[PDB]
Amino acid sequence: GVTTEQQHYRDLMSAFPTGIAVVTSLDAQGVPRGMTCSSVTSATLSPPTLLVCLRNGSATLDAVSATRGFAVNLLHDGGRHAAEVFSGPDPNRFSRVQWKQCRSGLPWLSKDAFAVAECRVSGTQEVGDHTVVFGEVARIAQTDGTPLLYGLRSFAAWPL
Amino acid sequence: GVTTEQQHYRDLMSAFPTGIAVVTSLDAQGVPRGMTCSSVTSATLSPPTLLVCLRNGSATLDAVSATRGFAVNLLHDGGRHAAEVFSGPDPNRFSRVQWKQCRSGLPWLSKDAFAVAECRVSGTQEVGDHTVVFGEVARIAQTDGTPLLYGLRSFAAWPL
Ligand SMILES: Cc1cc2nc3c(=O)[nH]c(=O)nc-3n(C[C@H](O)[C@H](O)[C@H](O)COP(=O)(O)OP(=O)(O)OC[C@H]3O[C@@H](n4cnc5c(N)ncnc54)[C@H](O)[C@@H]3O)c2cc1C
Ligand SMILES: Cc1cc2nc3c(=O)[nH]c(=O)nc-3n(C[C@H](O)[C@H](O)[C@H](O)COP(=O)(O)OP(=O)(O)OC[C@H]3O[C@@H](n4cnc5c(N)ncnc54)[C@H](O)[C@@H]3O)c2cc1C
Ligand SMILES: Cc1cc2nc3c(=O)[nH]c(=O)nc-3n(C[C@H](O)[C@H](O)[C@H](O)COP(=O)(O)OP(=O)(O)OC[C@H]3O[C@@H](n4cnc5c(N)ncnc54)[C@H](O)[C@@H]3O)c2cc1C
Ligand SMILES: Cc1cc2nc3c(=O)[nH]c(=O)nc-3n(C[C@H](O)[C@H](O)[C@H](O)COP(=O)(O)OP(=O)(O)OC[C@H]3O[C@@H](n4cnc5c(N)ncnc54)[C@H](O)[C@@H]3O)c2cc1C
C-alpha cells in the first residue's frame, strides 16, 4: 500500500528527458485546439499506434474526443517559442504560430515542427484526472530536423 | 521485418528522443528479468502513476504480469553498456551488469542507474502485440546524474 510522495515522483519524471510535440485537433465548433505534450509514446507497429496522455477537462482532450483524431507535431530545436505558447496562458495560440490544415483539417505547425503524424483515436483509458489516448497513425509527413528536448526542468536540443 | 508503412512510423518515432530505463522484475520462479525501455511516460499524479509499453510474450512482460511489480531504473550517461545488454539477444543479462536486489526483491541496476522507482501494476491494456502497463509508484530513490538518451538511432548524454 506504500505510495511515494507527489514531489518525489515529479523529481523522478523530470529526469526522464523527452522530445516535445504540439498535439492538435479541432473542437466541435471547428476551432483549432492544441497543447504542448511530452507524453508521446510508441505503443505498437501492428498497426502503427502511439499514445498521448492528456488532462481531463483540457481543451485539447475535448477536441480530440469530438473529432476522434489528432495531429502530433514534433518540434524541431527552433520550436521553443511554440512550445511555450502551447503550454502557457496566451489566448489564440494559433495566431502566434504559423499553421496550415492537413487534408483532414487537422492543424499542422508548418514552421516549428519537422514531422506531423495524423492519428485516428482508436481507444482511450482514463487514469485519475488524465486520459491515455491511443492514436492509430494514418499519415506522416517528415523532414530533416534536430529535435527539441525538455528535461530537468529545461529546454535543450538533441546534441548530435 | 517491417512493412514500408511500419518503417515510416519507425522513422517518425526515432525522431522523438527519450531517456532510457531498464524495467526489471522477478519472474514467477524468482529469476530476474528485464529490458531496455524508452516507453516510460507519466499518467497521473494522484496517486503517482507512470506507464510503460512492453512486448507481448517478452520475458519481462511475463514477469511483470506474474508478480504485478516492476522497477524502473533510469540510466545515467555511464549506462550505455547496460542499455545494450538489456536490449540484446543474450538472456544472460544479469551476469553482465552489477546489480543488487531491493528489499522487495526487485532488481536495481546500482552501478548504471541514477534513479530507481518501484511500482505496483495497477492495470494493463493490450494494444496490438504490446501491453501498456500502469505502475503506481511505491518507492523512489534518486541521486544526481546526467541522463542517458536515445534518439535518431544513437545514444547520447543529456547536454545540460
Ligand atoms: C514540456 C511540457 C510538456 C507537457 N506535456 C503535457 C502532456 O503530455 N499532457 C498534458 O495534459 N499536459 C502537458 N503539458 C501541459 C499543457 O501543455 C498545458 O496544460 C496546456 O495549457 C494545455 O492546453 P489546452 O488548451 O489543452 O488546455 P486548457 O488548460 O483547457 O486551456 C485552454 C486555453 O486557456 C488558456 N490557458 C492555458 N493555461 C491556462 C491557465 N493556467 N489558466 C487559464 N487559461 C489558461 C490557453 O489559451 C489554452 O489554450 C505540458 C507542458 C509542458 C511545458
Ligand atoms: C503527462 C503530463 C501531464 C500533465 N498534466 C498537467 C495537468 O493536468 N495540469 C497542468 O497544469 N499541467 C500539466 N502538465 C504540465 C506539468 O505540470 C509541468 O508544468 C510540465 O510537465 C513541465 O514541468 P517540469 O518538468 O519543468 O517540472 P515538474 O512540474 O516538476 O514535472 C516533472 C514531470 O512530472 C510529470 N508531471 C508533472 N505534472 C504532472 C501532472 N499534472 N500529471 C502527470 N504527470 C505530471 C511530468 O512527467 C513532468 O515532466 C502535465 C505534463 C505532463 C508531461
Ligand atoms: C514501445 C517499443 C516497443 C518495442 N517492441 C519491440 C518488439 O516487439 N521487438 C523487438 O525486437 N524490439 C522492440 N523494440 C525495440 C525497437 O525495435 C528498436 O530496436 C529500439 O527501439 C531502437 O530502435 P531505433 O530507434 O534505433 O530504430 P528503429 O528500429 O527505426 O525504431 C525507431 C522507433 O520506432 C519505435 N518502434 C520500433 N519498433 C517498435 C515496435 N516493435 N513496437 C513499437 N514501437 C516500435 C520506437 O519508438 C523506436 O525508437 C521496441 C521499442 C519500443 C520503444
Ligand atoms: C533504446 C531501446 C528502447 C527500447 N524500448 C522498448 C520498450 O519500450 N518496450 C519494448 O517492449 N521493447 C523495447 N526495447 C526492446 C527490448 O529492450 C528488447 O526487445 C529486450 O531484449 C527485451 O528483453 P526481454 O528479456 O524482456 O525479452 P525477450 O525478447 O523475451 O528475450 C531476450 C532474449 O532472451 C531470450 N530469452 C528470453 N527468455 C528466455 C529464457 N527463459 N530462457 C532463455 N532465453 C530466453 C530470447 O529468446 C531473446 O534472445 C527497446 C530497445 C532499445 C534499444
Residue numbers in the entry:
A (entry chain B), B (entry chain A): 7 to 166
What's the paper's own text on this?
Surprisingly, in both crystal forms, two FADs with very well-defined electron density were visible per ThdF molecule. The FAD closer to the dimer interface is stacked, bringing the adenine base and the isoalloxazine ring into close proximity. The adenosine is flexible and adopts a flipped conformation in chain A of crystal form 1, suggesting that FMN should be able to bind almost as well as FAD. In ThdF, the two isoalloxazine rings are in parallel planes but orthogonal with ring III (two carbonyl moieties) of the stretched FAD (yellow carbon atoms) and ring I (two methyl groups) of the stacked FAD (wheat carbon atoms) being opposite of each other.
The gene cluster containing the thal gene also encodes the flavin reductase ThdF. Hence, ThdF might provide reduced FADH2 for Thal in S. albogriseolus. In contrast, our steady-state kinetics showed that flavin reduction in ThdF follows an ordered sequential mechanism, with FAD binding as the first substrate followed by NADH and the respective products being released in reverse order.
